[PDB]
Structure formats: C-alpha cells, structure tokens
Amino acid sequence: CDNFPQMLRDLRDAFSRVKTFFQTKDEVDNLLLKESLLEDFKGYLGCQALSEMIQFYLEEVMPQAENQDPEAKDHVNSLGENLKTLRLRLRRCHRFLPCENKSKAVEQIKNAFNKLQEKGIYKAMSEFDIFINYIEAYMTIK
Amino acid sequence: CDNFPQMLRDLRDAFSRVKTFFQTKDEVDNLLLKESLLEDFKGYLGCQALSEMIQFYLEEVMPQAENQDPEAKDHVNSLGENLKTLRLRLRRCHRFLPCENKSKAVEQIKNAFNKLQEKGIYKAMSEFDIFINYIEAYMTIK
C-alpha cells in the first residue's frame, strides 16, 4: 500500500530512542533473529511468520523488557504502540497481512446458523455437497 | 497436489451415505451456504475462509447433528473423519492450506528466547532493527 519507508519511519524513530537501553550495537555475537526468519518471510508461510513475530514482541518480549528495565518503560511502550499501529495498517493492505483477516461470508453463515437453531443444523448438513463443490472450485482456482 | 477428484471422492462417498437423513434434495429454498462464500474462497481471504468453514463443520455442525439425529451418528462421524483426513492432506499441500501451517523459524526463535531467559529479552530488543529490516524486505517482496 505504498511508500513506507513512510510507515516504517515512525517505528525506526521509536526504536532509535530505546536502542541505547538494550545494547547500542546489538546482540552481535550469535543472532537471535537469524536469516531463517527472513526465508520464511520470503516463503509461502510469509504472513503467518510475520503475524506470529509481531505477536511475539507485543505480548512476550516488550512487557518483559518493561519489567527488567523500568527506566526504559515509557520508551518501550511507545515502540509497542507504533508496532500495534503498523499491524493495523498492514491488515488494511490486502497484500501485507491477509492472514490476520476473517471472512465476512463465513461470519454471516455462522450468524444465520445460530439464529436458525435446529433447522440450522439440518440445512448445513443438507448442503454439505455444495460445500464440497466449493472446495473443488477453490482447489481448482489455486 | 493433484487429481482429487481423487481425495474428494471418499468425502463425496461419505456424504452420499448420510444425505438421506438430512434432506435428500437439500435446504432448497433459501441457501445457508450462498455464493458469497465462494467469492471469499476465490479471493485473497481464501485459505482463512476454507479453514474457518472446515472448523465450523467439525466443531459446531457435526456434533450437533449427531445429537439431533442419533440414528445418523456413525454416518456423520465417518463424514467428519474423512473431512479431518482431507484437511490434513490440504495442509501438506503448500498451495491449499498454507494458512494452517506455522513457521519453524519463529518456533526456534521462541525456543531460544525462552532458554536464554533475561539475556533473551535483551537480545530480542537489541535486534529490533534487524526485525524492522526483515519487515521492509517482506513488504518489498510482496
């Protein structure tokens, strides 16, 4: 969806204000984030790998980082808000985090199925051959 | 990954043995599974929509179906085993359910990060600029 560089900048700016509290060089002997990650990012498991890493920093690394180093707290928190904010725009970009989005068609189907109760179950079951034809059409167009 | 028709057949066979207990025609007035589902299957949200529908049948519709109609129980259960079985092969097919797979690179990173304890957090934080460069490379190659 464009120029980031554009979006990325804030996020690099927020990391420059917190860099000095963590190393200021960086690990530098045996890396944690090795090129293996970059190959998955480049593969067919790309979105999942990115979504999973984003989630790893926001929920496991930053709060823990805020705890080891209370003087960095406000800097780390802002870094995590810019990262929360990037993920939201990446979701809006069909091409960047499709994998974090959910099917509105399935949500409606699930919502009718709940309203219909008993009849809901008989319809989902009677139409199972339509589901099978849609699977065949999906595998054929992919 | 090939000819299903090949894989799909069992699954149509299992549905033919259970069809007669649910309608034997099929809903037929206002459909539950409408073409909206087929458009998502055909779109960029394709895998998620399929994975979500598979999960919907296995966990919400079949067990409930087994309960409304105990005489169908063994037929529905077998249908659900053939569907459990199709999902497993679809996962193995990079092209069909990539979205249900997880990044081995991220699992290792998470596993070192846990072993390293405190140092784990300082390394993940010091290398955040490498993560940002990998995001830039991912957006650039997509």
Curated annotation (Swiss-Prot), chains A, B:
Q: What is its main location?
A: secreted
Cysteines joined through disulfide linkages? C1-C93, C47-C99
Annotated GO CC locations: extracellular space
A molecular function annotated in GO for this UniProt entry is:
cytokine activity
Q: Which UniProt keywords apply?
A: Coiled coil, Cytokine, Disulfide bond, Evasion of host immunity by viral interleukin-like protein, Glycoprotein, Host-virus interaction, Secreted, Signal, Viral immunoevasion
Coiled coil as a keyword of this entry, yes or no, is yes
Q: Name one GO biological process term.
A: regulation of cytokine production
Which superkingdom, per the lineage? Answer: Viruses
Q: What does the annotation say about its assembly with partners?
A: Homodimer.
Protein name, UniProt field: Viral interleukin-10 homolog
Q: Which organism is it from?
A: Epstein-Barr virus (strain B95-8) (HHV-4)
Q: Which residues of the full protein are shown?
A: 27 to 168 of 170
